[PDB]
Amino acid sequence: MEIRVFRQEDFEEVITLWERCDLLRPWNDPEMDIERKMNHDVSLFLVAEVNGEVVGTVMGGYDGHRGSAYYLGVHPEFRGRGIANALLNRLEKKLIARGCPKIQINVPEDNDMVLGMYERLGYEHADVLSLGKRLIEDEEY
Amino acid sequence: AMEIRVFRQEDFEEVITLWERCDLLRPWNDPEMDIERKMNHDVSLFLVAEVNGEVVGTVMGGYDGHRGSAYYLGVHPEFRGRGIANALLNRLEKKLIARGCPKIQINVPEDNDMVLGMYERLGYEHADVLSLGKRLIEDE
Ligand SMILES: [Zn+2]
Ligand SMILES: [Zn+2]
C-alpha cells in the first residue's frame, strides 16, 4: 500500500469507507465535510490505497498554530497491517515539513483502546476540557 | 473607541508585550515563532482589539477545513471591564461562519472555572472527549 493525497474521484469511495468504519456521526454531513475540506486545502487529507483501492483515511490539518486529525479509519478487512500508523506517521511528517510545531487530537473518552494506540506513538493526554460550539448546522442525511 | 481588526506586522512587539502582561507565554511556545507561523500560514483569523490606537486584546483564531480554533486569547488587565474578549470571540465566530466553518473547538484548563464559565456563557459546550498532543517542533 501507499499513502497519497485525497482527490475528487476518491469522494464516494471515502464516504463508503467511512460507512464501513462507523466514523459517521448524524450531526456532521460527510459530503459537506469533504466539500469543506476541498474548498479549504486537501493537502493534509490522506488516503491509503491498496490494490488501487482506498482502504484508510486521515483528514489532517493545520491552522497556522496546531495540527489536527479527524476521520482516521482503516477498512475492517485491512486492520492488521499498520495502516493507521503509516497514515499518522505520514501526516506528522507533512506537518513538520510546513513548520507545524504540535499536533492535537480528540479521542472519545470511553474509547480506552484508540487511546492506548496514540499513547504508544508518543501522544500525551492534556488536563484540559474540550469546549465546542456549533456555528453552521448540518441537516440530517 | 474600541475596534477589532486583523493582526498587522506593526502589531508584532505590542502583541508579545500584551501576551507577557496577560501571563500567556510559556517557555515551550516561542511567541515570535507562533506569530511567524501564523503569518506564513494565514493571518486573517488572527484578531486584535485596539482602543485609542493601542492593542489591548488578541485572539489567534484559526480554521483547518473542518474545525475552527482559538489560541492566545488575552485582554490587557486594565481593559477587562468591557466585553472585549466577548467582542473578540464574537467576531472570530462571524469570520469562521463567513468562510463556511461549521464548529469552533477550544481547549481550556480543567482548573480554570472562571474561563470555563465565560465560554459556557458564550454558548460553548463540553465534549466527552480527551485531548492528546504530540510536540513536533520544539521551541528553544
Ligand atoms: Zn470514485
Ligand atoms: Zn498529562
Side-chain angles (χ1 to χ4, degrees):
Chain A
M1 67 102 201
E2 172 252 18
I3 294 151
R4 57 164 176 81
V5 171
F6 175 92
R7 37 195 194 252
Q8 181 165 293
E9 207 249 336
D10 295 325
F11 180 101
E12 322 96 83
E13 287 81 8
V14 167
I15 303 306
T16 300
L17 172 60
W18 289 346
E19 164 224 47
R20 197 138 206 120
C21 308
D22 65 71
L23 286 158
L24 296 200
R25 315 258 76 83
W27 209 29
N28 295 318
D29 181 325
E31 282 192 31
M32 198 82 84
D33 277 346
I34 290 173
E35 295 296 352
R36 281 159 181 147
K37 181 49 163 194
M38 301 187 264
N39 191 59
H40 183 75
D41 175 20
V42 281
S43 55
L44 299 169
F45 188 1
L46 331 172
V47 305
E49 214 176 60
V50 164
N51 180 296
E53 172 168 349
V54 174
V55 300
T57 66
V58 63
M59 197 191 278
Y62 181 41
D63 57 24
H65 186 65
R66 293 295 182 258
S68 50
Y70 315 96
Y71 281 112
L72 175 88
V74 178
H75 187 299
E77 193 166 54
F78 291 82
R79 201 79 64 127
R81 281 80 161 87
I83 297 171
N85 254 68
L87 226 25
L88 269 328
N89 288 12
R90 186 68 168 266
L91 180 59
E92 297 171 13
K93 288 185 171 189
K94 281 187 174 273
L95 282 169
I96 291 166
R98 71 184 65 186
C100 166
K102 182 179 163 157
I103 175 167
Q104 300 189 344
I105 298 173
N106 300 312
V107 211
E109 79 177 70
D110 48 352
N111 300 3
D112 42 313
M113 201 74 118
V114 52
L115 210 279
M117 175 208 148
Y118 285 110
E119 290 186 305
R120 248 66 131 77
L121 308 164
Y123 284 77
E124 257 272 344
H125 162 225
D127 295 322
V128 291
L129 300 185
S130 185
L131 266 39
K133 175 193 197 174
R134 203 64 193 201
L135 306 179
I136 295 169
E137 200 184 310
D138 295 350
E139 312 88 70
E140 204 195 303
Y141 63 89
Chain B
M2 212 256 291
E3 272 138 78
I4 309 322
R5 53 148 170 93
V6 179
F7 176 91
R8 262 159 24 198
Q9 265 188 108
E10 204 268 281
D11 304 321
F12 185 94
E13 226 72 55
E14 291 76 356
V15 152
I16 281 174
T17 299
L18 171 87
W19 290 350
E20 291 177 350
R21 304 273 310 257
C22 282
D23 193 44
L24 280 177
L25 302 178
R26 286 302 176 287
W28 50 90
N29 290 140
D30 180 321
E32 292 196 315
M33 264 166 212
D34 287 340
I35 287 171
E36 294 306 341
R37 289 167 176 137
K38 186 62 185 197
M39 279 176 48
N40 182 65
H41 178 73
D42 173 11
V43 75
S44 64
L45 303 169
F46 186 6
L47 310 182
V48 298
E50 28 162 58
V51 168
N52 293 314
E54 174 179 11
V55 58
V56 277
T58 59
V59 64
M60 182 181 291
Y63 180 38
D64 62 4
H66 184 56
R67 291 311 183 243
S69 54
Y71 315 98
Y72 285 107
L73 173 85
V75 175
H76 185 85
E78 299 290 345
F79 287 84
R80 294 198 170 131
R82 292 168 52 147
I84 293 185
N86 165 17
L88 278 164
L89 296 163
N90 254 253
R91 184 76 171 266
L92 173 67
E93 287 163 21
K94 294 208 187 187
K95 281 189 181 270
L96 293 172
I97 290 154
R99 64 184 75 193
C101 168
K103 189 176 170 170
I104 186 170
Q105 317 179 315
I106 300 158
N107 294 330
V108 346
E110 297 183 0
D111 44 287
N112 211 161
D113 298 322
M114 298 267 171
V115 160
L116 280 159
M118 157 188 46
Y119 283 118
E120 291 170 19
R121 225 163 187 230
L122 299 172
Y124 288 66
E125 277 203 322
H126 309 76
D128 286 311
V129 103
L130 293 161
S131 188
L132 283 46
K134 179 155 164 177
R135 196 65 202 189
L136 302 172
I137 297 164
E138 281 99 78
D139 300 355
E140 276 155 4

